[PDB]
Structure 1
Amino acid sequence: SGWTFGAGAALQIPFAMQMAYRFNGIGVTQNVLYENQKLIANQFNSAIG
């Protein structure tokens, strides 16, 4: 549900779509995420290792 469950009812969002919203608040457009989806997943998944 992302973060909407901290203000009332919980609403579902695809996880790929949700990460675009976080980049939107940072200051970078959401388009850059989809153009680099594959390497980010490898970068993030190996980060926790």
Structure 2
Amino acid sequence: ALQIPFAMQMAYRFNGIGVTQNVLYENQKLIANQFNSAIGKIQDSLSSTA
């Protein structure tokens, strides 16, 4: 394993879907809020939906 900053890992993941990594760095706070929110939807989804 090689350490790498997580915002620098997602800039590699965006290149792997053909999106230029400035689309991540220009939107990092927004992308973080969408991921954090989406995990919040998983807590509620699993907490209710047996």
| TM-score w.r.t. length of structure 2 | 0.75
**RCO higher in structure (CA 8 A, sep ≥6):** 2
Equivalent pairs, count: 40
Query: 1 or 2, which has the higher helix percentage?
Result: 2
Output the aligned Cα RMSD.
0.6
State the structure with more CA Rg: 2
Structure 1 stretches lacking a partner, 5+ long = 1-9
List, as ranges, runs of 4+ consecutive aligned residues in structure 1 with deviation greater than 2 Å.
Answer: none
| Shift, 1:46, TM fit | 0.7
Q: Structure 1 vs Structure 2: percent identity of aligned residues?
A: 100
